């Protein structure tokens, strides 16, 4: 027993159910009736994989319960078999599981079943052209999912993991006028294949993203489905994708949707109780201290609500009375869904989910600035002497252009610009106190797509103050867009603190004029 989902065996019956999701999709631990105890008496299930969801029904005795095995369409539950129209999955016989355990069901979960037992599998190659199940559950990749020298065949895609189940019941005796098949898949579609007609004419999804609270949401008595967005915005997509305003009624992510027996309860992400009705209006105020994980509600009418419990992130049972809170505990973890399957009139659910897999049954106006006299005196001077200001500012601008051009030409002459057809960019960083400094030149080719093959770096220092090991070295092929850190170890030799500049010249190997240069004022030595 290790669930991923739960169920309710009897929608109005004295029983229960469960679901098994162990290893490699085996759903044969389905606990069973005598719901006074709901013991190890479990009905024989020959399901192919895990029923990633479950459901119920009314006109049949909850037969319409669905086994949404991954990679396969849900299946109405009929003890040992299925009931599927035209997209819901096939019978109990594992179509993927059987191939692994159809031909090569030789031995137990060990390499002496396939990789060291190649007797009953080199004779039987029955699951033909292995695509769905090339590897047995017992077997691993390297010689069981990699021994496809028999077939190595492929196949095509399918539907997705149907991470919801909700069905408008009371037609399961016909099983076709239960047209609601709320399949919120992990391909983001909120697909609703037709019930008993399997048309899925309308496959539209209001999710617009992944669904956190995909199901247990749109119970209107006139069937207005509710969907939850990954973004946390809750949509109101009704029957045949009806158009309704999508309520964004949350601040944080609403990953806590909960049915309430008249409306669709959702839980606020930031420790806020979630209350709401089908017209957006959050009916309830906050009632939860921490982040809940799975609500529910016990039994009362359309105008009515009995014990409506909740989970917690730190897993505290938080039974909520209609008029008051009940408890706050410190127990192990919680679920996505539970069920008040009381056979003998208990208020409590008696359903348990744990990191360890426990199956519980416990029943406890503006800022416009101001202007002073200085401003009006300055504006009066400008109004009375504007011409002289204009003329002298134009003269100053001419002289500034002159001096800037002068300094730019002098820099071009000395080639002192660390940024300068012929695209490059270099700057030198010094790190470390003490007599030994780490000098790293960050060099970069800045071009669309053109490398620079022949370049070389030469250092200019005072050979009496700094001892550079390699004062000249080639640079790697500079790929456009990558910062190459090329580092060296400078070392101060003067016993007295003397800070002298160090020049760096980057230049071609066929030319003698530096392509560019950089300067570094070496800090003080702090020697010994």
């Amino acid at each position: 027993a290790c669930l991923a989902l739960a169920d309710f065996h009897g929608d109005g019956e004295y029983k229960l159910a469960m679901g098994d999701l162990g290893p490699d999709g085996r759903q044969p631990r389905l606990k069973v009736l005598k719901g006074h105890t709901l013991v190890s008496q479990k009905p024989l299930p020959d399901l192919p994989a895990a029923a990633v969801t479950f459901l119920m029904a009314s006109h049949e005795p909850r037969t319409p319960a669905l086994a949404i095995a991954s990679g396969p369409c849900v299946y109405v539950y009929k003890n040992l078999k299925p009931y599927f129209k035209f997209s819901l999955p096939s019978l109990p016989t594992n179509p993927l599981e059987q191939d692994l355990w159809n031909q090569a069901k030789e031995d137990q979960i060990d390499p002496l079943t396939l990789k060291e037992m190649l007797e009953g599998i080199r004779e039987k190659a029955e699951v033909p052209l292995s695509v769905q199940s090339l590897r047995f559950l017992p077997l691993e990749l390297s010689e069981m999912e990699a021994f496809v020298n028999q077939h190595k065949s492929k196949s095509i895609r399918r539907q997705t993991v149907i991470t919801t189940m909700t069905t408008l019941k009371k037609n399961l005796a016909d099983e076709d006028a239960v047209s609601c098949l709320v399949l919120g898949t992990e391909n983001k579609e909120l697909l609703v294949l037709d019930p008993e007609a399997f048309t899925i004419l309308a496959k539209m999804s209001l999710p617009s993203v992944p669904a956190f609270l995909e199901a247990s949401g749109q119970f209107d008595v006139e069937f207005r489905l509710a969907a939850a967005c990954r973004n946390g915005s809750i949509y109101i997509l009704r029957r045949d994708s009806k158009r309704p305003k999508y309520c964004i009624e949350l601040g944080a992510q609403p990953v806590g949707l909960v049915g309430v027996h008249k409306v669709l309860v959702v839980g606020s992400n930031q420790d806020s109780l979630h209350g709401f009705t089908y017209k957006g209006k959050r009916l309830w105020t906050v009632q939860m201290p921490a982040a809940i994980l799975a609500m529910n509600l016990l039994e009362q009418h359309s105008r009515g609500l009995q014990a409506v419990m909740a989970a917690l992130a730190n897993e505290e049972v938080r039974i909520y009375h209609d008029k008051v809170l009940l408890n706050v505990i410190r127990t192990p973890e919680a679920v996505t869904s539970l069920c008040f399957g009381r056979y003998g009139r208990e208020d409590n659910t008696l359903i348990m989910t744990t990191l360890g897999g426990g199956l519980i049954i416990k029943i406890l106006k503006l800022n416009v600035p101001r202007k002073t006299r200085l401003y009006v005196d300055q504006t009066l001077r400008e109004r009375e002497a504007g011409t002289a200001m204009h003329r002298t500012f134009q003269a100053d601008l001419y002289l500034l252009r002159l001096r800037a051009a002068r300094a730019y030409v002098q820099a071009l002459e000395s080639s002192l610009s660390p940024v300068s057809r012929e695209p490059l960019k270099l700057h030198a960083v010094v790190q470390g106190l003490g007599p030994t400094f780490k000098l790293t030149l960050h060099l970069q080719n800045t071009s669309t797509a053109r490398p620079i093959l022949g370049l070389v770096v030469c250092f200019l220092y005072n050979e009496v103050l700094y001892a550079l090991p390699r004062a000249f070295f080639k640079v790697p092929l500079l790929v456009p867009g990558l910062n190459y850190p090329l580092e060296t170890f400078v070392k101060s030799l003067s016993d007295k603190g003397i800070s002298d500049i160090i020049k760096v010249l980057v230049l071609r190997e066929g030319q003698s004029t530096p392509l560019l240069s950089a300067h570094i004022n070496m800090p003080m030595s702090e020697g010994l």
Partner: protein
């Protein structure tokens, strides 16, 4: 291979990314890989974080596990497109399409890729296809963007109207259609759609800005000033808002309290020609003529192919003891202006004041060929006529 596929989806679905990662790691350690959904959800989680490299790697692994799956190829091409590589994204979307020819996502993403590749025929056709498969708002937005970049709003108004026709609660569509109405002569339906937006979102900055602009255009500066007061604190340092506020305060003869806002907006954006033009205009109106030339020359150096800029620079040079520069600036303006008679009238005034009276008639005739609402450009029209 996938014992706990659902639990992982429910943990990832509830925005946990902490317990989901632990369960992913446990499942992978048990199954030695080949899970195809502990790698997929882990890559999606990586993509939710800033990282789009490990997401690409793990989507590559998921594609390698299921070679014939269209969703995995779609996700790999999407991880490419989240980086800068759009050609490879197209070439992976193509393979994702030759396994599934019935989904809108491939066509929408090919459209947005061909958009970044400036191939507008293929982008346009692909986005038409994306509409025909399943109409979505973002496809409509990208098609409008194509029709705006390539050509004219004559092709975008139809698309945006058809888009807002259904699902009319999207603020982006309403606001963009209102903006495109502003871009044309219609000022009424623009106000209609901007108010439609403001009903949903009262504090929409991108819509309040355009509404206040439209209001300022037809006088009534106090209404636009209140509209801007609505959003002043949300965006306290934004050059466009302060430029519009300075023009509000310049409308109702608060010239100093307009120079203040305009200079503040200019400090926060020294390369924005509109604020420089406004500063020049206000310093002309304030009769300073030394600053006006400076700001108008800056706005010229930022947008030189304008006619009003050179007109105002020449009006500043006429009062700066430099009439030859005013002559050549007016020549530049009249050559570069087509549908504004104010330039011609002002050049006629300059000429007549220069004692010519000969070419002043030429500028008057040029103005009267160009032509009509300004109260003070009407009188000088008739006074330079009768006196010539």
């Amino acid at each position: 291979l996938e014992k706990q596929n659902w639990l992982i989806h429910l943990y990832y679905i509830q925005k946990d990314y902490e317990a989901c990662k632990a369960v992913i790691k446990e499942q992978l350690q048990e199954t030695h890989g080949l899970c195809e959904y502990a790698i997929y959800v882990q890559a999606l989680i990586f993509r939710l974080e800033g990282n789009i490299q490990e997401s690409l790697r793990l989507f590559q692994m998921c594609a390698f596990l299921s070679p014939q799956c269209a969703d995995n190829l779609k996700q790999v091409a999407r991880s490419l497109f989240l980086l800068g590589k759009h050609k490879a994204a197209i070439e992976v979307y193509n393979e994702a399409a030759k396994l599934n020819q019935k989904d809108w996502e491939i066509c929408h993403n090919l459209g947005v890729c061909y958009i970044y590749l400036k191939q507008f025929d293929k982008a346009q056709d692909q986005l038409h296809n994306a509409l025909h498969l399943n109409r979505h708002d973002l496809t409509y937005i990208m098609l409008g963007k194509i029709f705006l970049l390539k050509g004219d709003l004559d092709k975008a108004i139809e698309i945006y109207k058809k888009a807002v026709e259904f699902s009319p609660e999207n603020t982006e569509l309403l606001t963009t259609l209102g903006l495109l109405y502003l871009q044309l002569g219609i000022y009424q339906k623009a106000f209609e759609h901007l108010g439609n937006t403001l009903t949903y979102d009262p504090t929409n900055y991108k819509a309040i800005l355009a509404a206040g602009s439209m209001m300022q255009t037809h006088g009534d500066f106090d209404v636009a000033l209140t509209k801007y007061k609505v959003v002043a604190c949300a965006v306290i340092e934004s050059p466009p808002l302060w430029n519009n506020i300075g023009m509000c305060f310049f409308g109702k003869k608060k010239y100093v309290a307009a120079i203040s806002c305009l200079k503040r907006a200019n400090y926060l954006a020294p390369l924005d020609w509109k604020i420089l033009y406004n500063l020049g205009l206000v310093h002309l109106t304030m009769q300073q003529y030394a600053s006006a030339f400076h700001f108008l020359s800056a706005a010229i150096n930022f947008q030189p192919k304008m006619g009003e800029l050179y007109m105002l620079l020449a009006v500043a040079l006429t009062n700066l003891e430099d009439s030859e520069n005013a002559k050549r600036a007016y020549e530049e303006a009249v050559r570069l202006d087509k549908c504004n008679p104010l330039v011609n009238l002002n050049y006629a005034v300059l000429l007549y004041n220069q004692g010519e009276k000969r070419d002043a008639l030429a500028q008057y005739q040029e103005m009267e060929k160009k032509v009509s609402s300004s109260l003070e450009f009407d009188p000088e029209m008739v006074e330079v006529a009768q006196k010539l």
